[PDB]
Structures are given as structure tokens and as C-alpha cells.
Amino acid sequence: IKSFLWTQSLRRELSGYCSNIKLQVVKDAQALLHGLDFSEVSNVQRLMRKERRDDNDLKRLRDLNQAVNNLVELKSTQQKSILRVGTLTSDDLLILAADLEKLKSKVIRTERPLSAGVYMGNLSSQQLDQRRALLNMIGMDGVVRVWDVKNAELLNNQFGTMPSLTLACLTKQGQVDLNDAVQALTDLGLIYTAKYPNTSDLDRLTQSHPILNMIDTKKSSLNISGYNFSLGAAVKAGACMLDGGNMLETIKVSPQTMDGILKSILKVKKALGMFISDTPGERNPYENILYKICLSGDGWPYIASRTSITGRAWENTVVDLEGLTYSQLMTLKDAMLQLDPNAKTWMDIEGRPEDPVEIALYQPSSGCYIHFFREPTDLKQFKQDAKYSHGIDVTDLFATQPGLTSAVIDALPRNMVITCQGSDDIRKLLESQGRKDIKLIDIALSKTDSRKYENAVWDQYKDLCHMHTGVVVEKKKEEITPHCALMDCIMFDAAVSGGLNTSVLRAVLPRDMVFR
Numbered sequence: 001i002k003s004f005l006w007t008q009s010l011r012r013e014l015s016g017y018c019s020n021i022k023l024q025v026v027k028d029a030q031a032l033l034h035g036l037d038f039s040e041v042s043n044v045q046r047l048m049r050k051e052r053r054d055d056n057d058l059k060r061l062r063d064l065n066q067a068v069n070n071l072v073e074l075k076s077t078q079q080k081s082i083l084r085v086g087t088l089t090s091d092d093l094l095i096l097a098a099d100l101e102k103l104k105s106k107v108i109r110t111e112r113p114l115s116a117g118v119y120m121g122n123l124s125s126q127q128l129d130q131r132r133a134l135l136n137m138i139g140m141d142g143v144v145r146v147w148d149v150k151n152a153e154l155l156n157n158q159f160g161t162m163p164s165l166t167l168a169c170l171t172k173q174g175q176v177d178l179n180d181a182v183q184a185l186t187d188l189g190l191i192y193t194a195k196y197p198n199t200s201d202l203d204r205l206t207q208s209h210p211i212l213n214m215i216d217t218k219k220s221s222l223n224i225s226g227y228n229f230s231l232g233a234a235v236k237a238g239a240c241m242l243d244g245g246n247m248l249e250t251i252k253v254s255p256q257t258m259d260g261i262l263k264s265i266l267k268v269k270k271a272l273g274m275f276i277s278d279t280p281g282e283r284n285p286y287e288n289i290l291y292k293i294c295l296s297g298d299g300w301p302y303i304a305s306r307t308s309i310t311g312r313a314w315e316n317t318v319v320d321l322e323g324l325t326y327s328q329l330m331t332l333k334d335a336m337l338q339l340d341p342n343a344k345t346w347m348d349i350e351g352r353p354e355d356p357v358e359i360a361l362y363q364p365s366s367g368c369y370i371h372f373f374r375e376p377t378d379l380k381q382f383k384q385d386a387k388y389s390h391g392i393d394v395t396d397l398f399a400t401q402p403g404l405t406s407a408v409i410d411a412l413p414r415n416m417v418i419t420c421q422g423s424d425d426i427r428k429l430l431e432s433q434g435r436k437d438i439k440l441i442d443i444a445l446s447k448t449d450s451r452k453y454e455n456a457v458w459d460q461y462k463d464l465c466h467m468h469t470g471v472v473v474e475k476k477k478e479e480i481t482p483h484c485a486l487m488d489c490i491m492f493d494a495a496v497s498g499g500l501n502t503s504v505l506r507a508v509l510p511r512d513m514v515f516r
């Protein structure tokens, strides 16, 4: 296979950074066997069998992770890394910039729908099939979601496999002696020196080593945990049982060696034409090593406990030197799948329709919202708007992502029906953007009725917009509350429905995309 060729070439080029870690991995497995509550491993295992999990299920997982991370010596530390010209060339850093940007889009498109969700209700045959095809790639009110959680950033890094845990769970849960588990994984590792073990390989191994019957081979790397017995998990643990063999799983990184490692990876990339793919789902060898090494400047990126790490690899490793990309568009198109095209949808803008600076759409029934900004072109008019309506400081918009207006409007589902307050302006912007299919309801609240819930809305949802800093005034002058497209949708809807309800809203766009 192509994939094993990349793996073997990466194994030769990085041989020097590999280490002999069997002793430590077995010591950690021994510390878990003495210290961990395996009924709580079984409890997490039950919770992962559930098609739909909540924050109560996440706490049980996070808490088990922390208890494992306390018992073990192989731990990765929070180590952010800035890459600069030197060991890496100017060209090296540009290639790495592009690859991490592509990987960013790949991982978001794979993981984010597990929590953001994909609408699967009243839709065409064509749409449902495409959506099912995406759901099958990534291991997954008519919205399909696996995690129903308040803070999705708490899923980050809680799902990784660890050889010491796999070894300790195979022993205790499998009911065999540690020696018998190491034997089995050692044998699996041996195969792994020459090929990636297939179901035919496990089947044959399991005849001499019964413990490996716990591995379900028709399973997958996705949507599972460090407590599940994937072939991926065993193959990694088996690769640690070697001491020698140039196994990638054994590599150590420090800030002393991170640049050199990446440089060697880049050598293999150029030689074999490795790439980040644009398909969500399972990672090729390169996508894998890059993701892992970038997660932390200090650790064993393949085999350490990583459950304490906050941040994404593209956040923890950055490149430095002195519209949306295709990768960003793909991300966005996928994010939009959360929308119910049949649901009540509000829209509101700040700025004139020819030059909007804040756009928002809201669907009250599910609670999802689109919110983003735009640099104004006509600065003169923006200053009057700041003073009289939105109090946004033009300098604050500098850190926003451009290109969103065209791309979001372009991807609004067909024949969708949008409610607003003063349809006149939205029509103009929708028309300027190429969407005359979108039908509008104009609601015509009076000024005083439209703002009945203004204070109610800011009280609940203030943390959802920080853009409005300026003192805003109206002539009789009196100080007023600034106008935000988002709060305006929310408050107008509450005004129509005579009441504002208490529950989380769900941001349709990743924040990693509203801002650069």
C-alpha cells in the first residue's frame, strides 16, 4: 500500500528520534492496574455505546481521563510552539502554513458535526443521500448529533488512545495476566514492522492469543474513546512493545528537536508526494504525524496521555515570518448543514444594505445562529452608523474574517423563508448577492414593541457579542443601548412570541472562522 510506504519512509527518516519505551509503557500499565477503578472504565464504555450523550456523560469521561492522567508517567504537557525561520527555511514554513490550514479544515469537518449536528428532517432525496454519505465518513427536531453539550471545547483531546491504558484494560477487563497481554501485542507489533495488520492478520493471531478476540476489527478510529479496543489501539500498543524497530509511536519531541523533526517530515513529503487530503474521516500517515506533533512541543505525541492538553494542533503550533480559501469554504458548507431550511429564520443587519458590517440569522426553534462581521468600504457613513446605531469601532473589525457575506448568503438553502423587521434592506442585500429565490416576511413591529425585550436579551446573551463598544445616542441627546444584528433577531422574535425563553443558542459558524 501507498499508506504503509509513507509510514516506512517516515520510520527510516525519523529513526534517530525513536526511543526504547516498553519499560515505561508497562510501568504505566502497572500503575493503572493498581490505581484505576475499572468499573468506572466499564461505566465510560457503557456511556460511549449510547447513540446520544450529554454533559453528564462528558463529565464522567473527563473525570476518568484525569484519574488516568494522574496515575501515569508518560504525559504530554501544554507546550505552545512558534515556528520561525532557521532550521526550517522560508519555503518550509510556507508549506507547513498551507498544510496546517488544510488539516484544520479536515479535522473540523470530521469532528465538529458530532456536536454541532446535521439536519436530517424534511429534505430532498439528493440532500439526504449526500448528508448520509458525510455522516458515514465521520463515524456518526431532525438534527443528528452525538454530543449535546454546553461547551464543545471540553471534547478537545478526550478521546485519544494510549498504549498503557490499552494494556491495562486488556489485562483487567479481559481477565488475563499482564504477561499474556504483552505477548499478544508484541506479536501484533512484529507484523506491524512489515505491514498494517488486517482482519486476516488479527484472526490468525487470535488463534494463538485469545485476548486479541476483544478487538473488534470491523469497527473504526472515529467517534470512540481511549477505553475502546480498536485495532488502531492495539497496533499502537504493540508498536511500543518492540524496543527498537524505528516505530513512529515511540518518538519524543522537545522544543530542542521540534523544528528538526518537522524538517525530516517535510523531506519525506517532497519525496513521496504526501498531502493533507480534503476528505473528512480517517487520517493518512502524514495528516496523523502532523496533527500529533503540532498538538504539543513537549511529549510523546503518539502514546502519551494528551487528555490534559487544551487547544487544537493549529492553535498550539503557529508559523511566523515576514475571501475564504477552498478549505474554509468546504468547512462553511458543512457548518450550514445544521440549519433547518423549513424552520422560522430571522435575519438582521447593521450597516446599510450596500455595505453591511454585521450580519445575523437566527432560528428560534432549535436555537442556532449565524453571526459575522464585514469591513465597511464607505468609512464616512460607518462613523454616523457607529454614533447612531451600532457603536462598533472600525479597528475591531480588522481581526474579522472577510469573504463571509458572499459565501454565507450563497450557501443559504433554496426557497428558505426569512422573517425580518423592515424587509426593504435585506431584499436589497440578498438581491446584490444573487439570491432572489429567498422569500421574505416583513414583520413591522413599532419601535417600542420591537425593543420590549431588549434588556431581557442582553441580560441572557451578552457574552455572544463583544463588538459594540461605542456610546450610542439618539436625539430627543440621550444614551441608548447599541444595536447588534444578533440581539435584534432574538429580541424581535421574543417580541412576536410575547416572551424570551431560557436555553443555550448554538453558533452555526465556528468562531475559528468569524475571526482570523
Ligand SMILES: O=c1ccn([C@@H]2O[C@H](COP(=O)(O)OP(=O)(O)OP(=O)(O)O)[C@@H](O)[C@H]2O)c(=O)[nH]1
Pocket (backbone or CB within 6 Å): 110, 111, 114, 115, 138, 139, 147, 155, 159, 160, 161, 221, 222, 223, 224, 225, 232, 233, 236, 302
Ligand atoms: O467530540 C469528539 C471529537 C472527536 N472524537 C474522535 O476522536 C478522534 C481523535 O483520535 P486521535 O486524534 O486522538 O488519534 P489517536 O490518538 O486515538 O491515535 P489513532 O488511534 O488515530 O491512531 C477523532 O477522529 C474523532 O472521531 C470523538 O470521539 N469525540
Ligand SMILES: [Zn+2]
Pocket (backbone or CB within 6 Å): 358, 465, 466, 467, 468, 483, 484, 485, 486, 487
Ligand atoms: Zn453584535
